[PDB]
Amino acid sequence: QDVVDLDFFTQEPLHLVSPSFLSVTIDANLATDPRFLILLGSPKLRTLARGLSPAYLRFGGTKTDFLIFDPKKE
Template sequence: MLRFVIIIFLFEFALSANYKVYVNTSSPVRTVSDKFLSVTLDTGSSKTNFSGLNFSFITPLAKALSPAYLRFGGSDADNLIFQENLTLSNEFEFYG
């Protein structure tokens, strides 16, 4: 019981503390590549042929953020197989 009271006391003390943070913006500490920005699609969307995604919104967003990379992420990303196709198509084809 005493541990519980001490934990509650420390928690309340931490919430009541005020901090001032000053950031020196005169020069950058680190820089990143211009290609750092990316657009990520969750692989869970691929199971439904990306239904529900508004590509008329995503395409202009990706162009505005360019240069950028299209990244597929999520739990199933390790199971994706990409096949190079030299023809352009508006349809998605999934294998698996």
């Protein structure tokens, strides 16, 4: 048969995860895309991102260590 019995431990929490346990990234690479403003300004995209709140958005990746802030750039 294909019937299976589950056992549950429910006496106490074994761990506590963050409310932001399921979080997401944007790769540093994306800041090299000429359309970065259009992309992250997307209302459709922001609606989808709001669905996963609360969460961290981590901006990083290999390009983290190949990106330099330039306050003169436009």
